[PDB]
Amino acid sequence: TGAGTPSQGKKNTTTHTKCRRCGEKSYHTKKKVCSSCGFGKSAKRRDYEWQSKAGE
Amino acid sequence: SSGRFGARYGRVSRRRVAEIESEMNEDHACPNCGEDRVDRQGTGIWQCSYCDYKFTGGSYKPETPGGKTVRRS
Amino acid sequence: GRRIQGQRRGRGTSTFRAPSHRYKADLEHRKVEDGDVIAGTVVDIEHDPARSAPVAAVEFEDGDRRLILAPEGVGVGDELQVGVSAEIAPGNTLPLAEIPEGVPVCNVESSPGDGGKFARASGVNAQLLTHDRNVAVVKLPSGEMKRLDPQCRATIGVVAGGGRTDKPFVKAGNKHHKMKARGTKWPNVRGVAMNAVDHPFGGGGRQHPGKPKSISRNAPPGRKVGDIASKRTGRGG
RNA sequence: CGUGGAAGUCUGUUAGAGUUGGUGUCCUACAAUACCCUCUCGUGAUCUAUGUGUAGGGGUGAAAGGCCCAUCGAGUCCGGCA
RNA sequence: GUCGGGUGAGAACCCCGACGGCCUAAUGGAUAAGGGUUCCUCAGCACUGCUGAUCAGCUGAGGGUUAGCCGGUCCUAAGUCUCACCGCAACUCGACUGAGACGAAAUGGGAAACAGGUUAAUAUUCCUGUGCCAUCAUGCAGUGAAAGUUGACGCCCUGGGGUCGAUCACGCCGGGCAUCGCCCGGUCGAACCGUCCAACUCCGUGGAAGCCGUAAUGGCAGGAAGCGGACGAACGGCGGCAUAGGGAAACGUGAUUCAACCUGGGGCCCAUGAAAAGACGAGCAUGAUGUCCGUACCGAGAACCGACACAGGUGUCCAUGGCGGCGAAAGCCAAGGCCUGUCGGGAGCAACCAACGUUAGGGAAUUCGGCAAGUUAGUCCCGUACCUUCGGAAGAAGGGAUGCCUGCUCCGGAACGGAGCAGGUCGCAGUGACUCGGAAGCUCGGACUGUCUAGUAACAACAUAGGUGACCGCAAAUCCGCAAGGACUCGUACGGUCACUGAAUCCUGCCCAGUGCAGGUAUCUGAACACCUCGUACAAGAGGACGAAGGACCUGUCAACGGCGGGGGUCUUAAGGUAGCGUAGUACCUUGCCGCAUCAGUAGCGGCUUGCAUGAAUGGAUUAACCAGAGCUUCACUGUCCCAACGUUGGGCCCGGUGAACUGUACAUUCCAGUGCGGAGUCUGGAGACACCCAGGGGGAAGCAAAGACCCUAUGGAGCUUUACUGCAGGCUGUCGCUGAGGACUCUCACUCCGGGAGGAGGACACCGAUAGCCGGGCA
RNA sequence: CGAGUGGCUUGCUACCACGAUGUCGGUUCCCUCCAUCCUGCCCGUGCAGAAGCGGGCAAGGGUGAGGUUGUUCGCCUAUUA
RNA sequence: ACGACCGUAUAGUACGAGAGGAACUACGGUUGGUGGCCACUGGUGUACCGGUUGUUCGAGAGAGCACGUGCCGGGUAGCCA
């Protein structure tokens, strides 16, 4: 079975959902963790310096 | 008795399964009543259909050579 | 390269873990203050999934219900005793000191009160030989002479289910089922049939270990494969 | 002679799973792995839904360097980086 | 699809009728996920729709989802998170242990709802009727109360009970047909309340020494049959429910086979087949309360995922509609659905192409190769070789039969079940379509079922049982972590870890020199600390003494890595190839030689065989069975071929409509020669050439597509190896700290482990921190 | 021994193309060459005849089917002018 | 757009001791190629006619479907070898 089109057919699982904390559809409902703001993982907001060019 | 294995597995394997299963299926003398009515219930488990005596014993034989020693001493 | 199979093991993932949630009970010797006064009636005989052998359900005088490492010839109704004054019969459990010399014992304690360590597998048995005020010599199933504290408890008789290993599995399916009840990844792929990246014996145009199999004891995990610290190999000589 | 109904047993497009040949059709496709016929397994080491675990020099691997979201002899994203 | 008609400015495709068709585990019915308003109504056609559109999943506006008893909610599952504790430089990091919480919407467990009616759209939710559960309140009964039962359970075979359905019989109601008198539909009615009880178990009687009983196993003086009795089932029967409902009407009655559902018997495990909440136990009356969230629609060849209205992918239940037949098979047909696998019109419709039918004579001559195609086929009877692990081979092979009609026999309680008989009789053909093996032999490989390169490899590769070796007594071996800690392990040598070989059968020779591992070791070598000498008012530093593991040295070991020759009648470097097998999937020479087979055989098979360069768990030989595995032979068959023809369907061509892409330095009607960086439409010389268009099969544009995969180059990259360079983990070992009292020894008080505890074991060791030596592609 | 022709073999060179000029064998279909195997016309003969052997002109036409091998090549069989 | 071969008469002749054994010429045919044609033979012929299996239309009659004829038998014109 092909990894392409024939494997896209089984994609009806819901994972990432609208986040209670940040409002982004990044709250993984199976992990109970937001991939965007880190809600469910940390009290502090998810943020990294690599999200921008080093001298900015 | 290893006729279920068809023409598969080879002599040794099925000759042993036949011997072992033959002695396993034999009429066994119950340690209670004394009647030849003990039948295997599972792995190492035996039971008399007469008096219902359920007991432990060899995996395929109700008594093992090592078990028959425990008495003598 | 990549970590070899033996290294994935230690991580304890599902694939390598035992079906503990499917195991019945940890067969340990019952505790008694002293004086012995403890007896129970065998209420049932069950199949132990962790050991592929029969385990006896007992109900003690103080209304205590627990599974026991059943020796051979233990039936329902049978009365078992556990303590210093426990009658010297099969199925009973008393400290080695009270057990007569030259008597087959099973579920032997390593340190007094640990609940039994040695001789527990199907049909095996330890052998009490020498007595003393300090050390009771037991001959374990491997043939090793083990000097023990005479206060170490141990059940009389040989373990039930003996001769289990006498019948061949015959087919892969039969092994498959047995394996599913143990903490073991099966089947087994020979290292020699893998890529060099995956195992010390991997690679080559034809399958053969690219080095001698006997490895040093000091070899690091990831390289300690084949014949570990083999004192010798082969049958001849 | 009958009874019995065993089997990683047999035939089988039962359901289901698989994928031998046609090097057929297609090859700006219906489709970034499709179509048709043929073929294999089909009570078991079987197939399957959902839930769940294992994470990148790490998993997972009946081992093909296979697979880990069209990405694998070391995933993906951004950063290092002009 | 067609003919009429409807609506409209406009109609091939929007609607009505008729005719004609398609779908039958789906193209029908109910849903999970997922979508999210796609649902209904009205008004539209700028957008979207493979053409058109009055239509629409499109555009816009309105409307639409009603619950004590259907889900959620509650419970617990693999498992997850949080808090505490501990680690960590630290945390949003990390394992354990505690506590708490989370974790199941079709498909785990679970208090309770049925029938009808109603809407454009909801419906066990609203309405009508009837019913039920829980909590609480009051009243009465009640003092029992929680032990126990239940929730609650694997795979295979099977009996009994039994509803729906289906069919048979007959009656009633209605329809159809019209030579007959047959054919179709209907003949209804729930939850709930009451009641009945088979199986299982037990009790009394009875008194079997051979009887009772089963589909089968089985039962019995430890008490069989028989007789009586307690307990005890259905989503079943029966009565109510019901001058409820429903129907135009009738508004049935019996039977068989029986899904569901109920209840038993047997067999299997080196496999043992959840838990908890909850219910029961434990009465009745009356009354109150039963909130909160979900509920539309699609659920797919247009509502989901795949950029699309995608020929792909996507779970559950309807598995019992009729004929057919072994059948949930074919084929045909209901119920229900559809003509939207959504562009049409025209040409006897050419060439050419896709898919296919039939081909006389020959019959594999085709080809690398029977690739492709064909042959065979169901069922019954007869019959069946070699070989074999005695199972099998085997449907071997081969031969015969096969319909319809009439009248019957046998088995069975009977079937609308099965097996046969006699007579008659039609065809070219009776498994008449459909369904439905071609057969045999030799050789190689792997024993077998199984696994694999999602997307060029299904194989001889991986796996397997079996064989074997290695490590470890558990405070273990092996493995993960920086640590706190953890897997194996609810495990204990009949264990489980690490490897090899790969069913059975016959076997598995010799070699320990090298490398690897391991044991030993007088002596040699072997670090740091401490100690000793020199040096320095001290220090650096130089030297000595003792000496751990390690090495030297000695031994063990090849089912460890591997080896098994040359010369002569010992040399290397240990031995010098044993059984076997052999021109091999290993043999260069090579198409080896002989034979078989053929007209002819680099093929195949057998024999020989000095083997370029076979050979014994780097397993040797051999082998029944099995195989989408490699090679060869035969019978049969045939358009593969001789050698091609005609036909069928869809395209192709013409017409309406819709409407891309690839590609493009320029010029360009070319041809023959030459020339040129040596492979020119374009240069030179000739030749030829009026322009434009249609169809074709592809000679050329070193055609289009891709900064060549091959080769080289770069003080380029990566993956992999090792006795490459250098380092880093890890293991072993000495030493210092923890660390104490009296080169060997006692002790208990730190510390460790066992123990519920008391206490027991061990003990200044071990652990841990630090340093030193050795090993160290495990890793950079 | 000596002199040459060709450009089918092989070797040599590294001129051409590495932002690709798709392999061998086979097949199918078209044109050509002569260094002629057959066929036509000839000369010589160790030419009686018959059958051959050697040579000359000559490219009109022909040169086929099969067994092993992927083979080209080649070996083999039966037909053939 | 025709290439080539076999056979007969020549002739059992010329020639030769014999064995053996021609030619010119005139005829008949075969093969390969070529162009055309279908009276004849053969193929096709999902025009057509018949037989017949399963199922549906109640039976009969007469029909649909079984893939673009369910299958089997015969086959006109035409096109063909």
Ligand SMILES: [Cl-]
């Ligand atoms: Cl095992």
Ligand SMILES: [Cl-]
């Ligand atoms: Cl719901």
Ligand SMILES: [Cl-]
């Ligand atoms: Cl029964």
Ligand SMILES: [K+]
């Ligand atoms: K090139």
Ligand SMILES: [Mg+2]
């Ligand atoms: Mg235990």
Ligand SMILES: [Mg+2]
């Ligand atoms: Mg497991």
Ligand SMILES: [Mg+2]
């Ligand atoms: Mg293996």
Ligand SMILES: [Mg+2]
């Ligand atoms: Mg490999």
Ligand SMILES: [Mg+2]
């Ligand atoms: Mg490696």
Ligand SMILES: [Mg+2]
């Ligand atoms: Mg091997």
Ligand SMILES: [Mg+2]
């Ligand atoms: Mg090997």
Ligand SMILES: [Mg+2]
């Ligand atoms: Mg899963």
Ligand SMILES: [Mg+2]
């Ligand atoms: Mg490889």
Ligand SMILES: [Mg+2]
């Ligand atoms: Mg409208």
Ligand SMILES: [Mg+2]
């Ligand atoms: Mg609706």
Ligand SMILES: [Mg+2]
């Ligand atoms: Mg569509």
